Amino acid sequence: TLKDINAIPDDMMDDIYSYAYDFYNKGRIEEAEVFFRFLCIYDFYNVDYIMGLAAIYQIKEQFQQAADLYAVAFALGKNDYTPVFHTGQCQLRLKAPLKAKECFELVIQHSNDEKLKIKAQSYLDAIQ
Amino acid sequence: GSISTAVIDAINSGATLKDINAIPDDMMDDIYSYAYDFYNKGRIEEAEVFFRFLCIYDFYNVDYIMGLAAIYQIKEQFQQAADLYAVAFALGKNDYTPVFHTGQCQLRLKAPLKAKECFELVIQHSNDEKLKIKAQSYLDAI
Ligand SMILES: [Cl-]
Ligand SMILES: [Cl-]
Ligand SMILES: [Mg+2]
């Protein structure tokens, strides 16, 4: 990868990541998408870069595309259940409530992030 | 590897072979069986190609991912194995076998606290009593 060869300096990469989120926070989604795609080309193995791109797909209602990337993000992180939470949201939008339930249940059972667990439980409470 | 392919596919967001149903389910089953035929006979290099082929076609298949992860673990490519085991768990969230194997990989990667976390999860959440015994044996050694 480009990261493996140190093709752009670390501080420049940080800046691009911040600009990507600046675009995202301002609702400049097309530009944010370009920037997160750029970041994920540069380092496919970076969980936060992958999470930024998955968030763009989720915003654009490309819920399967987002869920796929979230699954990769979880795997690379190991112990961050934030991607699993967002996968749950995607599964609800895909009309797969039992898959969604499974995601939120995993957050509740495995995560030590108390605020994330509250959010997961709020979704579980709503699922019929 | 199989993860970079999945990510490149997601980035490019174009038509994949899966999107067009380029290989039918029964053909994929046959290739999977041939992959394991190679594996069972110790032809690991050919098995690896076949599981890589399967994971290019349909990366989000627990059984395909598990086959490939096992090969990397045998080859002492422990980071690669751990990553794929974590994918396997994510896709099949009720089977703690991949979490157990991730624990093993983490110990070999000199990450005992990550390993401990994996084996603890097995103990707390798995209903596989024999797997729990194995997980506890590793916890006792940490
Ligand atoms: Cl469902
Ligand atoms: Cl890879
Ligand atoms: Mg129990």
From Swiss-Prot, chain A:
Keyword Cytoplasm: yes
Keyword entries, A-Z: Chaperone, Cytoplasm, Plasmid, Virulence
GO cellular component: cytoplasm
One Gene Ontology molecular-function label: identical protein binding
Compartment(s): Cytoplasm
Keyword rRNA-binding on entry: no
Top-level division of the source organism's lineage: Bacteria
Homology family: Belongs to the LcrH/SycD chaperone family.
Purpose of the protein: Assists the correct folding of nascent IpaB. Once it is bound to IpaB, it binds to IpaC and impedes their premature association that would lead to their degradation in the absence of IpcG.
Identification of the protein by name: Chaperone protein IpgC
Organism: Shigella flexneri
Source lineage: Bacteria, Pseudomonadati, Pseudomonadota, Gammaproteobacteria, Enterobacterales
Residues of the full protein shown: 24 to 151 of 155
